[model samples]
Target: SYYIRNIEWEGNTVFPDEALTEALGFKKGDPFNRKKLEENLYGNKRSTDVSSLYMNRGYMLFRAEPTIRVVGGDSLDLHFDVYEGDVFEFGTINIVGNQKTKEHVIRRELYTIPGQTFSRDAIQESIRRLAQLNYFNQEALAAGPEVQINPEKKTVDLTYKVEEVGRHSSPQEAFERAMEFYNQGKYDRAIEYFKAVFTYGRTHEWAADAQFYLARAYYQNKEYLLAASEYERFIQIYQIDPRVPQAEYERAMCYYKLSPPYELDQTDTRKAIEAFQLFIDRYPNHELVDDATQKIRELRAKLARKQYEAARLYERRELYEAAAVTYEAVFDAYPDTPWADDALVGAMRAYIAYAEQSVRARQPERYRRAVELYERLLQIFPDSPLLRTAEELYTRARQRLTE
Candidate 1:
């Protein structure tokens, strides 16, 4: 053909027509050479080919075709058809045959992640690093990674088949490194290393200790909420280990520090008491049983103070009926708490205050109820600093009744 008169392209909306024309290195009415046209569309080396450009960008099923039509006598028309297929994302990079090592361990070594563009380079690097771990045997890795493409869903899934070097060997490095970090007072760094030890799947001697220290590191880092769950993870896995008692104690301690101020929600306070009670019940003869028991008492006292503040809130608001009930709850629920005497006195006062607000018909019974509380109080703790105040309130009630 003498020259190209017209150039036409179809089926490409991703790359602009002008850009594709430039990428094609052709313009309308240029000298037409089919051999050069073929080479330009599918170049030989590096990322020079249009195929490489689309494929590298996750267009795995891309196709391009060219047709030259002779027009009239001396001119030719170029028709370029392109199919830039759907961009594929990674769906799952799964690892299998790691009987002793955890999946997350192998996964952490991968350069490929779900929802990212599928890259052959990333997968190749992933395989190299998997082999570099020296955890898997050579034969399975030599067999190569398996890839499955889902054209309908536009997703790519990969599986790395691995073999443990020696299923019997321990994973002591990460744990040892973590312990050194912890001792060095780099608790934040120690936490990640301790977590990495779990990749060995509780097979080695370091497994239990790693799990325990992981929780401890979070605690030392002041990540109490994270520490709470880590402690539970250790306890659930190693219930038979002697460290279970210690885990329970620290687990309870997590919630103890997690508790809000007394005037706020008391649920964490209740949680600490329940947890300490659990530790005490599980290991009675352990050296820390006394400590656990004492913690429960302290936590109960915290709840008592919380309830005491709420009762006082209602009392100050003149919600005397609610105040009396709330104070009675604190007194009955935590009678052994140091706040017990105060709760008893407070409840009696709330009721007396309620009585003063009541009509003549209601005063006597409420006054009688107040007198009964004082009698109960003096029998329980006679040396209270508030006893004289209750005694005068009692004398006032009797004098009013006599009238």
Candidate 2:
């Protein structure tokens, strides 16, 4: 209900008088339309624009309030108070009322860590991610931030309070549904239904059990990442649960399912070893321990094979240095694995092949490395089929080095 013939400014210093006028898209003596003023009244919408203008720019509690002063001459003095709020970064995120779940584990899952810039959006996202983890009940996991009342020191600290959702009814209901489906060979559907079961109930105990089952369903469905997540959740939620042995073993399998050859990332392979170790340590008497141990050996052997294939491929293309490093990773990471015997041979072959292509005189070092690899294999797997081949190579490697 207000019309203006002129736009006046009061606080105009860091922001040049011209910049504000241009930003508002109005000049001196321009009509002060209500619709135009609405923009100034409303806060920022875009995250980057607001973040840069406010938080990133050290305006932690930046409050912008526009005061309309009636000039009485059919004009308005738009008094703008640019009170620069103290730069508030995130302080410690404290979790209270937590039981069952480890505080460090919960903190690890948070998206925004302490000392990061205080961002409401990021904090919210972190909370949502925690809720989605199915490790905590939605009603139990609570997080929020509080600003100190001191106007002089405008700092803010975050507090997170979590209550463990004990294992109980609703979670079991969902898990049962998945079991029903799984029993009928509907692995895909069973996985989905099992996953959905984690979304209910106040107690997480049932969900933890369900999560391990969910991983098995996904493994059956061939969805490695999904399966890995379920397995991880199971272990995280129920370290002492009765089903821990199964959880650890299945988690290792999940990583194995995701692991590619040595030419690709071997992160999953390493993860598998860690999981298998956990199973071995926790359930030493488990009937499946031997098989799990054997599988680990096979997986480790594959790691070495992958290195050989990659190095051999690279050597074919004449990428000697890359091939060397790729082959080296095999020994460096999985030297103790059961496949180390094969890896030793492959390393010897790669080194000799590399030395042959070099313009420089073949260094005695190449054959020395080959001799060492052969010795390792000969000593470790004395009964191996390659024992004779290893001896033959070791003798030749020594001869070549001396020559």
On a 0 to 1 TM-score scale, where does candidate 2 land against the true structure?
A: 0.46
Give Cα distance to truth, residue 81, candidate 1, Å: 86
User: Which pairs of residues have clashing backbones in candidate 1?
Assistant: none
Regions of candidate 2 where Cα sits further than 4 Å from its true position: 1-177, 188-200, 204-215, 235-240, 261-263, 314-332, 337-339, 346-362, 367-377, 395-403
Q: How would you encode candidate 1's per-residue C-alpha lDDT over 1-403 as one tens digit per residue?
A: 4787877779987776666566566667688876767766765344445665666678877788888788888888878899987898776455566556755567667776554577655676787788888988766786768889999989887877777776213469888888889999999989888878878777578899988999899999999889989899988888798888889999999988876655444557778888888888877888988877888888888878866775676677676765776687687878899989888888788878887888889788878877888998898887888899889888877777655
Give one digit per residue, the lDDT tens place, for model 2 in 175-251.
88889888888998787778677678425666665777788888888887787777777777777777877777877
Worst ten-residue run, lDDT, model 2?
A: 43-52
**Candidate 2 residue pairs in clash (backbone atoms < 3 Å):** 165-203, 165-204, 166-203
Clashes of each: 0, 3
lDDT of each: 0.77, 0.64
Shift in Å, residue 100, candidate 2:
40
Candidate 1 accuracy as lDDT: 0.77
